[PDB]
């Protein structure tokens, strides 16, 4: 189908923003160990909100890309509106670049005044640093996009893949609405904050990832749509059965009742299962490929995604998800280690997987790129992925020493925050070096086009 | 074991746990007044929350262990810096003197806050420090 070409600006933009996100990571990584680097021009928190908002916005673009490419194909017809896809692309891209500029060009509190945040205070919460008007703009874009892809599913062939995608996509946009809710009570504010972050990333985003993976395996594997869709249901069932009460693993120490200690730990202990199932899924259905496929990078991206998501989300998540352990590790470098590997392994990787399948055939090159381009893509996969394991190990070692020095001893014997950080310097230099190998990997990946 | 079976499990399981979760949320909501000592949640503390937000303190600091990991945990800072009685006075000096300008040291910005705003900030952090948090953090260092 011809209207699948609208997916292209989304994937290209996503990749540009991905580059920005890395540059800003590298800035903060240096700030950790040369603490006045770029100060006061770009203080750490400014570099941070750019790094973390560019991560979310680029994945959101990837998701829209992915939906624009596969939804027409699933529905067996043209997309409801190629021209709407294009208006929305420019509005979303313009709003994203404008708000980044906001963060970079006007001190934060000045940005708050200027966007009239005091009428409706949503600013200055983690991952939610965008002006309220800028959040509103993002809702309007999400509503547009949902109508577009949703109308396509309506007049069109329904499949379980497309309907689980639409469910995740709708749930994503609904849950975002909690970012307009800023309670005056700190505990209450934190309680509903996680309805955005956790119910996205261990809930509704899992439906999006699983559906993208499912579609890619239908196309690359020639295994039966029926068997694929059954597992897809098993996987999202386990995601929501573990993950909805599992939200409680963020409710240990924020000021809500101690029953969450039990509920949070027991249900989140099971949240690895759907990532484990996605590994059995992709390995088993690639082993049973009734046909061979010209683009051997897509298959690597798909197996790679599931292993890294399972390591980053399942294994590193489990490591700290039990309350008696989390008590010591909460808000520590161990958190940053898990957050990086989980976000990369599940979400960055699935976006690059769908791009790897869809790019050649959006550019009308064929199913695959030539053999020189395919070795580059693979080189960029291994460089980025190995670097990210090293980022995770170095921060994990830093997290262990942090907990040992700062968190375990008694008052008097425990080391102070700032003194501990100096003891962690070495792990931070290593993380920074790993971060450099990652950017190189991203360059190698990009030069594969 | 069929597609149809898997889909019904997905359906039943999501609805059940969705309802369980809202039931827990309703209950938890009713306990917050006591756990958080909401009686004390003064106009001063609520304006302090705005100051915290508007200057993105959480972009460098953790509070109750959430936020950024560049700078210290501010949930119990009141215990490392003059306690109940002298903490407001400490905070006024602390905000005025930034940045410390130690070569190579992690730097905090000058926010040019008024004394009213810093006092609201102090009341907010003092109040935060008293939330029943199930004994988190492990010690006075946060």
């Amino acid at each position: 189908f011809a209207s699948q070409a609208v997916a292209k600006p989304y994937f290209v933009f996503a990749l540009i923003l991905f580059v920005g996100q890395i540059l800003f990571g590298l800035i903060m990584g240096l700030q950790y160990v040369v603490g006045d680097f770029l100060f006061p021009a770009i203080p750490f928190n400014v570099a941070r909100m750019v790094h973390t908002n560019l991560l979310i916005v680029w994945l959101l673009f990837g998701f829209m890309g992915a939906a624009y490419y596969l939804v027409p194909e699933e529905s067996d017809c043209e997309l409801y509106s190629p021209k709407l896809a294009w208006i929305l692309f420019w509005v979303f891209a313009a709003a994203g670049v404008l708000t980044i500029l906001g963060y970079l060009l006007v001190p934060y509190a000045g940005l708050a005044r200027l966007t009239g945040n005091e009428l409706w205070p949503t600013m200055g919460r983690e991952f939610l640093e965008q002006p309220t008007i800028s959040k509103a703009g993002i809702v309007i874009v999400a509503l547009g996009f949902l109508f577009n892809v949703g109308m396509t599913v309506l007049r069109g062939r329904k499949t379980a893949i497309s309907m689980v995608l639409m469910t995740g996509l709708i749930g994503l946009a609904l849950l975002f609405l909690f970012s307009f809710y800023n309670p005056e009570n700190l505990t209450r504010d934190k309680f509903y904050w996680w309805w955005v972050v956790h119910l996205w990333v261990e809930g509704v985003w899992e439906l999006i990832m699983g559906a993208i993976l499912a579609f890619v395996l239908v196309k690359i594997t020639g295994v039966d749509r029926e068997v694929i869709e059954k597992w897809l249901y098993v996987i999202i069932a386990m995601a929501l059965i573990s993950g909805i009460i599992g939200t409680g693993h963020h409710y240990f120490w924020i000021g809500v009742p101690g029953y969450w200690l039990w509920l949070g730990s027991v249900f989140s202990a099971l949240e690895p299962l759907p990532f484990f199932a996605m590994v059995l899924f992709a390995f088993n259905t690639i082993n049973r490929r009734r046909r061979d496929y010209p683009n051997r990078a897509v298959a690597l991206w798909a197996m790679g995604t599931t292993v890294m998501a399972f390591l980053g989300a399942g294994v590193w998540g489990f490591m700290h998800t039990l309350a008696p352990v989390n008590y010591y590790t909460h808000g520590t470098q161990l958190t940053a280690a898990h957050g990086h590997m989980a976000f990369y392994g599940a979400y960055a990787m699935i976006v690059m997987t769908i791009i790897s399948y869809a790019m050649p055939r959006l550019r009308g090159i064929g199913e695959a790129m030539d053999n020189r381009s395919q070795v580059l893509e693979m080189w960029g996969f291994w460089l980025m992925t190995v670097a990210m394991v090293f980022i995770t190990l170095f921060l994990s070692a830093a997290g262990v020493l942090q907990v040992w020095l700062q968190r375990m001893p008694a008052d008097g014997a425990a080391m102070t925050f700032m003194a501990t950080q100096d003891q962690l310097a070495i792990f931070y230099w290593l993380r920074e070096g790993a971060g450099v190998v990652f950017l190189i990997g991203l360059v190698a990946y990009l030069l594969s086009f | 074991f069929t597609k149809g079976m898997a889909r019904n499990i997905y359906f039943g399981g999501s609805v059940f746990f969705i309802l369980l979760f809202l039931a827990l949320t309703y209950h938890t909501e009713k306990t917050l007044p006591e756990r958080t000592n909401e009686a004390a949640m003064s106009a001063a503390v609520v304006r302090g929350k705005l100051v915290w937000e508007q200057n993105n303190c959480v972009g460098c600091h953790t509070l109750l262990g959430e936020g950024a990991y560049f700078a210290p945990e501010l949930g119990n800072v009141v215990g490392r810096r003059g306690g109940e009685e002298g903490f407001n006075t400490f905070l006024q000096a602390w905000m005025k003197i930034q940045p410390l300008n130690v070569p190579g040291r992690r730097a905090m910005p000058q926010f040019h806050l008024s004394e009213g705003q810093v006092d609201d900030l102090a009341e907010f952090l003092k109040w935060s420090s008293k939330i029943d948090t199930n004994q988190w953090p492990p010690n006075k260092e946060g």
Partner: antibody
Framework: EVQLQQSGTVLARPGASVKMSCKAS????????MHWVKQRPGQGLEWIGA????????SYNQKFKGKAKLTAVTSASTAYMELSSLTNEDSAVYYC?????????????????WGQGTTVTVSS | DIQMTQSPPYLAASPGETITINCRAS??????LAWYQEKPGKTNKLLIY???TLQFGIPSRFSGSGSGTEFTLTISSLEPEDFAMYYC?????????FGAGTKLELKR
């Protein structure tokens, strides 16, 4: 309350050695450089060196490399200075004091708490 | 090593008046100059660091300024407890070094 308690007056013969202590309380002992400073009557303060109890590293004024040895014992939150091969010029008050800032890389800073001083009197 | 020279070595003054004393470094110490108060029977007390930052709990009647090579300490309206010995110390480089002091005495 951050406090530093120094040991009492010591008397020694020329060429002998003396060792004095500084007991820290009220703060994270392993997180701050502990400095030592010499004051001879009518003579102005001199910085001898510092020890960082979080990793045992030490730093010495070149004028005191021969003279002073600095150590710390973590469990007791106490720092020590040993002065050797004593001379009349080592008769002085010796102070320990805490960096006003925590961490390893603030070696050269100012101090916020001082001990009350230990007198060393070198005589035959 | 940076040598520090304080002048004057003695200054007599009265309650209610303002005084200002000097500290000179032999080379630039950027802005990193601290001051201490010494009194009989008490431990030495940090007053100011980094040239002009008041230490926590120090009354605002004390202030200081300077950079590079030349620095001052001012007390705005002397109080009886302010008559004391005052030392400056550079905190820009190894080895740390101190001036020898200004003694502020009570005029009668």
């Amino acid at each position: 309350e951050v406090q530093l308690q120094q040991s009492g007056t010591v008397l020694a013969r020329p060429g002998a050695s003396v060792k004095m202590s500084c007991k820290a309380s009220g703060y994270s002992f392993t997180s701050y450089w502990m400095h030592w400073v010499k004051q001879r009557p009518g003579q102005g303060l001199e910085w001898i060196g510092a020890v960082y109890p979080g990793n045992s590293d030490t730093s010495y004024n070149q004028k005191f490399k021969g003279k002073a040895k600095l150590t710390a014992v973590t469990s007791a939150s106490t720092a020590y200075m040993e002065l050797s091969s004593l001379t009349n010029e080592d008769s002085a008050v010796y102070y320990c004091s805490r960096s006003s800032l925590d961490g390893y890389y603030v070696k050269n800073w100012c101090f916020d708490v001082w001990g009350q001083g230990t007198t060393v009197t070198v005589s035959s | 090593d940076i040598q520090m020279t304080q002048s004057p070595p003695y200054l007599a003054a009265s309650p209610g008046e303002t005084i200002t004393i000097n500290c000179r470094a032999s080379k630039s110490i950027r802005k990193y100059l601290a001051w201490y108060q010494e009194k009989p029977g008490k431990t030495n007390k940090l007053l100011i660091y980094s040239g002009s930052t008041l230490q926590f709990g120090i009354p605002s009647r004390f202030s200081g300024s300077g950079s590079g090579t030349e620095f001052t300490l001012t007390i705005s309206s002397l109080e009886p407890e302010d008559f004391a010995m005052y030392y400056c110390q550079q905190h820009n480089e190894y080895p740390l070094t101190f001036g020898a002091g200004t003694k502020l005495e009570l005029k009668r």
